[PDB]
Amino acid sequence: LYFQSNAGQKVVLPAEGRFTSGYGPRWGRMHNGIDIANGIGTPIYSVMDGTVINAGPAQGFGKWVRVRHDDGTITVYGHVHSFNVSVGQRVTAGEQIAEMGNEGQSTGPHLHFEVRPGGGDAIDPVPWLKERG
Template sequence: MSHPHSRRVRRGLIALAAVGGCALTTLVAVPASAAMTGSEKAADPASCPVAAEISQGYHDGHDGVDLAAPLGTPIFAAGPGTVTESGPASGYGQWIRIKHSDGAVTEYGHMNERFVNVGDTVTGGQRIASVGNEGQSTGPHLHFEVHRDGGTGFGDDPLAYMSERGVSLPCTP
């Protein structure tokens, strides 16, 4: 059984090796599926999910990033895909999950309003919801998660995922 953070550890070691210029990358096995080619980036481009500031980052106890914005601020799909969840969710009040062509799932929580339903096909940058303060929340924000594994387990770093697709968080749609 692999350690639950092994993918994150491998990516961190590879990044450190690249910055330091050492040969550590030869010691770490990275599956070919972990690398994204130029054609994949073009096929599934990312879009800014919300105009907001990061109020809580990604870490071992928080598997997404919180983006604080005024109530009602538009939320956009981070990329093209199919809506797999849209409605009430424990802790979130309301949530939306979108499955993308690379197999990843992006997750959006604490919405005030949702504008998409399960089964809808969305485009990157399409308005899907508005920022809310629903569920377990201390103020209006978007909780944004990425699950490269298709939606199970602890989420992956949304900043890294979006950066690989050309979008830095925070951003402006």
């Protein structure tokens, strides 16, 4: 239990690379996160301190990780090539949790990243990452 006036918590980028696909419709279908493109193997980071709640195969994502942050927000890391965390593991903002995947397809290697306040519906990640404090 902590006493704090302003609730701000440190947030960092989940991966570095080209911003190739934003939140919203594309090719007639909603995209519920953002895509950040770079080579296979590019490190993927937890954006905020939190606890890993998923790490494994997922249909459609190939492999994924999810991290639950202490304010209840869940962040999602999809299309990873591999992950180095276990469910229940505590991670620090910016710590490497996975490597970028999406290999062998017409869409190049990238991270798919989602933000889910309260663990619920996804929101546009860009203001959540870039418009804080």
